[PDB]
Amino acid sequence: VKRTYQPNKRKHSKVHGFRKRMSTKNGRKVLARRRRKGRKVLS
Amino acid sequence: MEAKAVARTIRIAPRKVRLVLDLIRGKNAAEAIAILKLTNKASSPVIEKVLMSALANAEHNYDMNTDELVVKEAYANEGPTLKRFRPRAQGRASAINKRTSHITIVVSDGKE
Amino acid sequence: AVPKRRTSKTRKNKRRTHFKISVPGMTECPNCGEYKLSHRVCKNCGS
Amino acid sequence: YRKLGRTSDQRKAMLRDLATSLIISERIETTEARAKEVRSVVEKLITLGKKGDLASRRNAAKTLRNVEILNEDETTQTALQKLFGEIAERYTERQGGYTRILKQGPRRGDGAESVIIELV
Amino acid sequence: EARDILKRPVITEKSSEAMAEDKYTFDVDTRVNKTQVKMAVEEIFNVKVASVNIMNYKPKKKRMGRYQGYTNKRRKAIVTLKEGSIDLF
RNA sequence: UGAGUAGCGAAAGACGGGUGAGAAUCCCGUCCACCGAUUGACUAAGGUUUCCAGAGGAAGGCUCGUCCGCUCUGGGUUAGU
RNA sequence: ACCGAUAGUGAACCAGUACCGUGAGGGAAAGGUGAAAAGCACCCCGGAAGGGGAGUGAAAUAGAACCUGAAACCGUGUGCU
After folding, report:
1. Which nucleotide has its C1' atom closest to residue D21's CA?
2. Could you tell me the CA-to-CA distances from B36 to C1, D67, D86, D107, E26 in Å, in that order?
3. Keywords, A to Z (chain A) (predicted)?
4. Closest alpha carbon to E15 in E81, E82, E76, E63
5. Three-state SS for D50?
6. B76 forms bridges with which residues in the sheet?
7. How many Å does it take to go from CA E79 to C1' G19?
8. CATH placement of domain B1-112
9. How many structural domains compose chain D?
10. CATH number of the CATH domain containing D85
């Protein structure tokens, strides 16, 4: 049966990329939130 | 006198190794060795190696006669158990127990 | 299809009365010293 | 007769293999059940070889496989030729017997009573 | 420059078989091209280079009991001489 | 506890040598058979060292293992088209 | 007149780390050899693991090392039945 989550390198970086998160104001908050927690991976 | 030998962390369920320990309990060293070479089990080979070591200790450290020895005690205790997992019908997972064993044999001549 | 009550140590040890192994034939050899199974191929080949 | 946990065709194929392997080295070791089934198949093949007529040759080629035995001095010969050769000469005054079974100890992998079937 | 470009030589069973002819393997930097490699190996050993081959290597993962980590990126380079030799003791 | 109970998820295997403390399961050989518009041969997406050699299976791989597309210790990818 | 490793921060140790989710996000378990490594030379059984001696030490306390209870559970031997 066809399951969900079809792996794709290009799309992955074109949606959850660092530049994509730094293109809006809401996305910037996410980075700030993760940085405060101390997460090793930001994106 | 008395001589003993133990085998710790033996990968074998204690309930399966206790079935071959009730055939050489109270027998002679000669008979016991012969019964372990005729028994068709997966514990006989391991138990035979332990009994052999027990006899060598009584003929070297105590220098006793190995032609008049008799198996006095013979039991098997439990040891650390390993935890494993294997998938089921849906997204459930059953548990598997890989128990070990602590075989012990005490050979003597029956004299204080 | 599921146990109504747990089994005790008495009933559990009573069911394991015939659950055991039996001593084999073990025929003596005429010239070898070691033992062997009856009707087998060795130095005794039974007795 | 026994079925040896196999299909009609599979069982017929295995029997032919064992028989041919018991005429190449004349000393094979297998299980007891299979040893009591190939003992009444290789005995019939020897009987055909004793005849030595053309009819038997064709009847003996409906069971024996196509193999190449290697003797001394770089000598080669098919199993069929060997069956109608030395083998036929050896047993010419003995009426019955031929094969013989010898019991052994159990296997390690499983508790199967292994035996040894050889020609007398 | 023309001294930090090459790190150290490579001595293996493959290099020895490639050492039969005028071909040597060297560990260059991970930022220099082939042109610079050929303009830095013929000025240190005073020889004539014919061609140069370069290949990258992804970092390999390692471990040693509750200790994760990776290796450093490596840039192999095979130089071919037209006439001469290299004293690689 | 239920219990030494349910289960152990794709093709047909036979014997002879070999190695080894130990072989139905590993290596070589001869038969035999199955897929056969595919359980064949390529390229892409994806995965990211699983690839090769020599040592160990002590844990893992639904049994065994001297090995298991396989897990623990050395090396391998070259372009003016 | 705060806590003393299920407590006190989610985190005394490999913590926002194993792992889980496409993503925002969620989020653990795990402290203690001895005063001093003086960490069992050497012999015996065994393929090895493990053991029996012998040694160091006040004491094996021996690298699943302070104490080591159970609701537990699993055994071996015996006095009455």
Report:
1. F15
2. 41, 44, 46, 15, 65
3. Ribonucleoprotein, Ribosomal protein
4. E76
5. helix
6. B103
7. 48
8. 3.90.470.10
9. 1
10. 3.90.1030.10
Instruction: Output b/e per residue, D87-113; b: 16+ Cβ within 10 A.
Output: bbeebeeeeeebbeeebeeeeeeeeee
CA distance B28 to B55: 11
What is the residue type of D68?
E
Look up the domain containing D75 and give its range. Answer: 1-120
Q: How far is residue E52's CA from residue E34's CA, in Å, rounded to a whole number?
A: 6
Distance CA B48, CA B51 (A): 5
**Contact D66/D78 with Cβ under 8 angstroms?**
yes
- Identity of the amino acid at D119: L
Answer whether CATH 3.30.70.330 is correct for domain E1-89. Answer: yes
Provide residues 49-108 of D with CB closer than 7 Å to any strand F atom. Answer: 65-68, 107-108
Chain C nearest-CA distance from D78, in A, is 33
Residues B1 and B110: beta-carbon distance below 8 Å: no
Please name the method used to determine this structure.
cryo-EM
Indicate yes or no: strand G within 7 A of the C-beta of B11: no
Burial classification of residue D63, based on how many CB atoms lie within 10 Å of its CB (0-12 exposed, 13-18 middle, 19 or more buried): middle
- Length of chain B counted residue by residue: 112
Residue type, B51: L
When divided into structural domains, chain A yields a total of: 1
Q: Look up tokens 């027998």; give the residue.
A: B27
Q: Which residue type, as a one-letter code, is found at position D30? A: T
Q: Are D46 and D91 in contact (CB under 8 A)?
A: yes
Task: Give CA separation, E76 vs E6, E7, E46, in Å.
Answer: 10, 10, 21
Residue with tokens 């159990």: D106
